[PDB]
Structures are given as structure tokens and as C-alpha cells.
Symmetry: D2
């Protein structure tokens, strides 16, 4: 699992379960192509989101469907989506964790990149 997520709900104080996301890779011409989808489990994580073979060096975009998450919680959200875009260098089994803390009108995102 070279690419992990950890999503927390700042209203309830729990992980954010059943958050849908989409992973895209930047193409040589400057656009995007979607390579994977996932939904968080009750711990706010997605196991086996993509394989190492699917995660070579390059720029990736992870789109988190925060609007649906909040709608399904019965809240009104501000953001249409939460996007995280980063250049990955998985050389040497370098692993990436995208952390996301959700509120209806706010999110915080950070990354933990292993050695």
C-alpha cells in the first residue's frame, strides 16, 4: 500500500466512514486520467487503494467527495470536493499517507511521507 488515506470527522470526533474518492495521474500532455476509486471504511482508511505497480513516480490528484459525505450526514457543506495534488517519488518503497480533517465549511489536509 504505497498510497494511504486517513479521514477524520471534526463534528462527531470519529473517523469519516464511506468517503468516496478518485485517484488520477497526470498525463504527459498535462491533463489527468483516472486510475482508481475507493471508499473509506469505518476507520477512515482505504486498504489496497492502488498497487505499487500502479504508483510510479509522477504527479497525482486525489479527489475526495466531501460534499456527498456531508450531505449524507444531513449537513450543508461548503466545498464541492476536496482535491489533493502532489508529485510522488515512490522510489525506495517511499509511502504516502494523505490525512484529511473534515468540517462542513473547512478541511485540513496534511501528508506523511515515509523514509
Amino acid at each position: 500500500c504505497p498510497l494511504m488515506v486517513k479521514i477524520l470527522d471534526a463534528v462527531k470526533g470519529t473517523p469519516a466512514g464511506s468517503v468516496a474518492l478518485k485517484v488520477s495521474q497526470k498525463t504527459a500532455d498535462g491533463g489527468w486520467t483516472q486510475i482508481a476509486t475507493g471508499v473509506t471504511d469505518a476507520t477512515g482508511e482505504i486498504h489496497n487503494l492502488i498497487t505499487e505497480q500502479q504508483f510510479p513516480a509522477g504527479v497525482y490528484r486525489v479527489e475526495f467527495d466531501t460534499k456527498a459525505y456531508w450531505t449524507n450526514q444531513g449537513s450543508t457543506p461548503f466545498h464541492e470536493v476536496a482535491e489533493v495534488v502532489f508529485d510522488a517519488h515512490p522510489e525506495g518503497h517511499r509511502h504516502y499517507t494523505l490525512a484529511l480533517l473534515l468540517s462542513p465549511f473547512s478541511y485540513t489536509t496534511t501528508a506523511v511521507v515515509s523514509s
Copy 2:
């Protein structure tokens, strides 16, 4: 102005000056049309970014070039960009402020939406 930003630097405890951004408006086909560009002043703001006339209801995208900000600050950043995407309902002189708090490997974004 109907669309304001406020960018702060969490490493230095100052506003984030000279951050470039782009504002786009979603098209019925799901494309994006760029409608404005700008650069924050030393208070982390952009005054008169767009007019009310230019800000009808619809989905908007604001793309903050945080990578150049951090590279110029001498830090290596994680994110290639920071994008904020939201549906706007400007009816009644409802105004939007996008607040962004930057660190090299993290950002917090929130919105303040005024009453009619």
C-alpha cells in the same frame, strides 16, 4: 467585492504575500473557464478580484500557486497547488471569503459566507 481571500503563513506568523491565484467558473459541460487572476498583497488579500457582475451563481474554482510560494520561501512543499472548489449563491449581496492557512506539508482552508 463578492469574492475575497485571506492567506496566512503558519511557519512565519505573517500573511502570505505575493501568492498567485486563478479563478475559474464551471461551464455547463463540466469544463472550466478562467475569469480572473491576481496576486495577494502583503496582507494576504486580493482587493477587487472580480465584480459582482462577473460572479453569477455557479460553481467556481480558485487555484492558489502554493508551490511557488514555498519554493520562493526556501521550503520544499508537498502540494503542487491548492484548489478550493465551491458552489456560489451570490443572491442578495452574499459575499465569500476563502481563508487559507499554509504550511509546507499542510494547509487548512475555510470559508466565511456573509448574510444577505
Copy 3:
């Protein structure tokens, strides 16, 4: 106005009005002396909280009553209080703004220090 606050509500997307706060100064013996109290207005701010004369160099605590903010909203919060503790060096008309972004189970706090 050497000491300013700005409090936002991450659930509703508004300033956090009517938040009570207390300002304390650390004493030589390791204790705290309360020097000011205040309540945020509808913009999430407090004007004329303390004067420059009252704000000599030293360590200060600002205690925000976030629990009552959420409880009076009908929400259920985690934190008893939010405290911000910092060493101030106000020489040269150096001003401090404490920014606070509130959710029921989270808060983000940052500082803007002028030149």
C-alpha cells in the same frame, strides 16, 4: 490594540460571536494573574481588550470558552476550553492576532505577529 483575536466557526461558515475569553499574565512565581476578560462581537473579534500599557513583555495565556460556544448552539463539543499560551515581545508597537477556527471536536489556532 496590541492583542487581537479572530474566531471563525467551521460548521456554519461565519465568525464565532459571543465567545467569552480571559487574558492572564504569567507571574514570577510561576502563577497566572488575570488581567482582562472580553467577549467576541458578531465579527469574531474583540476591540479594546487591553492597552499597550497593559501588555508588557512576558508570557500570556488567552483562554477561550469554546465549550459554552458549542453548548449554547445545541452542539456537543469535546474541549473544555481552548488555551493559547505565548511569550510576547511587544517592543516597537508589535501587535499580536490570535486566529482560532472552531469545530465541535477540533480547533486550529495560528498567530499573526506584526513588524
Copy 4:
């Protein structure tokens, strides 16, 4: 473990290692009694910070020595400490994880509470 911490460093994108902290319980007279100290490991966690025997219902403070962390990282920090203050087990026993995201002039705290 009824009380866990997870500390991340938003400058480097790593867990925050070797962060010292102190856990205190509020006393009926308004004082604080220290019940434990600890130091995070390289994963930004402290295993077995307190035991169940040390964790009756009541108000607790976790004081994180963030200033020493940044000083050793070679940065100039704003805050003296980061304090997290919460009522434990208000409606019955729970387990608590205190997440803390550190920058030199800012931090984000949230909590994950489970049954």
C-alpha cells in the same frame, strides 16, 4: 490504552518524534494534579501513556512541549506549549486519541473518541 496521542509535523511531513508531554487531572478545588509524563516515539505516539487505573471520569489536561520541539528542529516557534483540555467519560467510559498537527506558528488539535 485509554489515552493515545498522534503528533504530526506539518513542515517536514513526518510524525513529530521526541515531543515531551504531561498529563494532569483537574482537582475539585480547581487545581491540577500531574499523573504522567511521556515522550513521543518516532511514529508521533506514546504507548501506555496512562493506565485505566489513572483515568476516572473528570477533566484532564495534556500539555505538549511544542516550543522545545521547534527549538530542536531549528525553527522559531510562537507557542510556549499546546494544551488540550477535555472532560473524560462524561456519559460513560470512552477511549480517546488526541491528534495534533504542528507548525511553528500554528497547531490543529482534534480528538477521536470511541466506545
